[PDB]
């Protein structure tokens, strides 16, 4: 840590403190986050070093001292939470919108390729520059350290991205769970709000089960037998995603759609998504950006 000067604290991240630092012989500035060591961990991180794309925040080099674990990463200057709400008045404009999406799901589709999950995509995540780039940040940390119920400060990790089949207690989730995460983000960035915004488990799920319908064997075959399934499930109808997400187009909500799913395994990928004629007209503008 000696070779890093602290410039200010960014925030607490999932796992620690998070700095922006300075590189004392390169120069380079940088995140810096602490990790709250075991061997596997040590290895999977290991491997995300070679997981390069430019959708994905890159992972400079790991440092293990002292029994004490800093991730050093690419440095962006905003993050899509903070510019969501600075763009709360007037909306992000929807070019930018699918320019971000677009991106998103070419980062995905890259690290899905390698079997690599997020799993904790959210908009405090997704990283901007101002070239109109996006970025994932903290990928692959959760299968090295976990998805805790609360951060190291306590905070509440949210559940509001997180997919039905993790809340239902499926064990082996897959990569569907990141194509579930951004498009509620995708819909949070067209409406201005939050799609899911539970605030417990069963609350996350009855507002899916309160938008989506109440899933059942025929939507999703199987979803009955899951460990968190309950027959006592309240029965919602589905709402129509024109009123949903309103106003989105027909392309855009017909790849919402897809992108939420009920069954995992029929749930679009991010290549077949990349296809989707809503990206016929994409184009990559740039955000404004007060640093
Ligand atoms: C929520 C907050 C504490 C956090 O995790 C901040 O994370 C980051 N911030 C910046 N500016 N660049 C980064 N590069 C990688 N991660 C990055």
Redesign the pocket.
């Known amino acids: 840590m000696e070779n890093f000067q602290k410039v200010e604290k960014?925030?607490?991240?999932?796992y620690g403190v998070?700095y922006?630092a300075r590189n004392k012989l390169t120069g380079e500035v940088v995140?810096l986050?602490k990790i709250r060591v075991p061997s596997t961990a040590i290895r999977e991180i290991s491997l995300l070093k070679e997981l390069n794309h430019p959708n994905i925040?890159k992972l400079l080099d790991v440092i293990h001292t002292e029994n004490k674990l800093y991730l050093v990463?690419?440095?962006?200057?905003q993050?899509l939470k903070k510019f969501m709400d600075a763009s709360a008045l007037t909306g992000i404009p929807l070019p930018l919108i699918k320019s971000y999406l677009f991106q998103l799901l070419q980062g995905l589709a890259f690290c899905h390729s390698h079997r690599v999950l997020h799993r904790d995509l959210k908009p405090?995540?997704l990283?901007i520059n101002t070239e109109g780039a996006i970025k994932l940040?903290?990928f692959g940390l959760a299968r090295a350290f976990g998805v805790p119920v609360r951060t190291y400060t306590h905070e509440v990790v949210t559940l509001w991205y997180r997919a039905p089949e993790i809340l239902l207690g499926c064990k082996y989730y897959s990569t569907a769970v990141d194509i579930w995460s951004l498009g509620c983000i995708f819909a949070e960035m067209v409406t201005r709000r939050a799609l899911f915004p539970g605030d417990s488990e069963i609350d996350q799920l009855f507002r899916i089960f309160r938008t989506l319908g109440t899933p059942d064997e025929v939507v999703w075959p199987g979803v009955t037998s899951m460990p968190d399934y309950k027959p006592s499930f309240p029965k919602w109808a589905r709402q129509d995603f024109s009123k949903v997400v309103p106003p989105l187009d027909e392309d855009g909500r017909s790849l919402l759609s897809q992108m939420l799913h009920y069954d995992p395994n029929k749930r679009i990928s991010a290549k077949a998504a990349l296809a989707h004629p809503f990206f016929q007209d994409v184009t990559k503008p740039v955000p404004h950006l007060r640093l």
């Open positions: 960014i925030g607490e991240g999932t998070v922006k995140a986050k925040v990463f690419e440095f962006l200057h993050d405090q995540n990283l940040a903290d």
